[PDB]
């Protein structure tokens, strides 16, 4: 028995504590790199909270057992000055992850897919406690965002998935692929950077129009 609630600002510490136990250790790229202590990922995770569209799953005892942290993304301005997230990161392992994100954005702009949309919801960090996996919590967190989207006239939910494992969860929830890149093909300076196990196969950007 669990509830799905809006993450409040005072929940920051508890959200980070939960993510340090799970996501920091067990998201495929984090685990592949052995991310360790990573204040930059704490910062990255906390950033979207004041957008007021991030959700926690909470068990009967009041413990956070899952989160889906979301942020609003806005179409680049006509005069936009594009920036690389990796440039401002001093943590070498997390910088590899941000550089992969920057690379995806250089190859693929979700706003090209949806020329009429000015605001899109971005699903940034999704994590469920191991003892509560396989129960549909990721789907219940995801679907709570549809309520926010309705209330605010947002049509598109965009989620960059770091493995085919998490892309399949989004597919089951009615998302479809809009971009993919195999890890075997990500060679930004001429050589492979990420070589997780075969089943992960690479990134997939997933989208749903709700
Ligand atoms: C934007 C991003 O954050 S991308 C990165 C996404 N996050 C991660 O990779 C972090 C590590 N993974 C996790 O935290 C979780 O596996 C999640 C969040 C991806 C999925 O959460 P869940 O609430 O377990 O999702 P769900 O209940 O749909 O289960 C997904 C699949 O896991 C498998 N599964 C079944 N039981 C379990 C279990 N005990 N433990 C693990 N996986 C299980 C099944 O294949 C299941 O699919 P199915 O139920 O449709 O057959």
Swiss-Prot record:
Mind telling me which residues the site (Acetyl-CoA) is annotated on?
Answer: 172
Can you give the residue ranges of the N-acetyltransferase domain?
126-199
Binding of acetyl-CoA, residues: 126-128, 134-138
Q: What is the effect of changing residue 44 to A?
A: Reduces catalytic activity
**Reactions that this protein is recorded to catalyse:** a 2-arylethylamine + acetyl-CoA = an N-acetyl-2-arylethylamine + CoA + H(+); serotonin + acetyl-CoA = N-acetylserotonin + CoA + H(+); dopamine + acetyl-CoA = N-acetyldopamine + CoA + H(+); tyramine + acetyl-CoA = N-acetyltyramine + CoA + H(+)
Please describe, based on the UniProt annotation, the reported consequence of changing residue 158 to A. Answer: Does not affect catalytic activity
Per the record's keyword annotation, is Oxidoreductase included, yes or no?
no
Q: Which UniProt keywords apply?
A: Acyltransferase, Cytoplasm, Melatonin biosynthesis, Nucleus, Transferase
Listed pathway(s): Aromatic compound metabolism; melatonin biosynthesis; melatonin from serotonin: step 1/2
Q: How is its activity regulated?
A: Inhibited by long-chain acyl-CoA thioesters, oleoyl-CoA (an analog of acetyl-CoA) and tyrosol (an analog of tyramine).
Q: Which GO terms describe its biological process?
A: catecholamine metabolic process; chitin-based cuticle sclerotization; dopamine catabolic process; melatonin biosynthetic process; octopamine catabolic process; regulation of circadian sleep/wake cycle, sleep; serotonin catabolic process; sleep
Keyword Acyltransferase applies: yes
User: At what residues does the UniProt record annotate the site feature described as Might be involved in substrate binding?
Assistant: 44
Q: Name one GO molecular function term.
A: N-acetyltransferase activity
Per the UniProt record, the site (Has a role in the catalytic activity) maps to 27, 162, 166
KO phenotype (gene knockout): Has a darker body color. Shows ectopic pigmentation in the wing hinge, the posterior pupal case, leg joints and cuticular sutures. RNAi-mediated knockdown in astrocytes, does not affect numbers of astrocytes present in the brain. Shows normal baseline patterns and amounts of daytime and nighttime sleep, but while awake are less active. Upon overnight mechanical sleep deprivation, results in increased recovery sleep next day. RNAi-mediated knockdown in neurons results in normal patterns of baseline sleep. Shows lower levels of activity while awake during daytime.
The outcome of changing residue 161 to A is: Does not affect catalytic activity
Q: What is its EC number?
A: 2.3.1.87
Name the record gives this protein: Arylalkylamine N-acetyltransferase 1
Organism of this sequence: Drosophila melanogaster (Fruit fly)
Which span of the parent protein is shown here? 56 to 265 of 275
């Amino acid at each position: 028995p669990y509830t799905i609630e809006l993450i409040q600002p005072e929940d920051g510490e508890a959200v980070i504590a939960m993510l340090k136990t799970f996501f920091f250790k067990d998201e495929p790229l984090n685990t592949f790199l052995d991310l360790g202590e990573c204040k930059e990922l704490e910062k990255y995770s906390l950033k979207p909270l004041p957008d007021n569209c991030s959700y926690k799953a909470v068990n009967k005892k009041g413990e956070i057992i899952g989160v889906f942290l979301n942020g609003l993304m806005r179409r680049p301005s006509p005069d936009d000055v594009p920036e690389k997230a990796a440039d401002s990161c001093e943590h070498p392992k997390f910088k590899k992850i941000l550089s992969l994100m920057d690379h995806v954005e250089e190859q693929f702009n979700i706003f090209d897919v949806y020329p009429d949309e000015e605001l899109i919801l971005d699903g940034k960090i999704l994590s469920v406690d191991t003892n509560y996996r396989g129960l549909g919590i990721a789907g219940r967190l995801t679907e709570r965002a549809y309520e926010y989207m309705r209330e605010n006239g947002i049509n598109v939910y965009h989620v960059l998935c770091s493995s085919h494992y998490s892309a399949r969860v989004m597919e089951k929830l009615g998302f479809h692929e809009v971009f993919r890149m195999q890890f075997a093909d990500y060679k930004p300076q001429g050589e492979v950077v990420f070589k997780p196990a075969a089943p992960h196969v690479g990134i997939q950007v997933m989208a749903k129009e709700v």
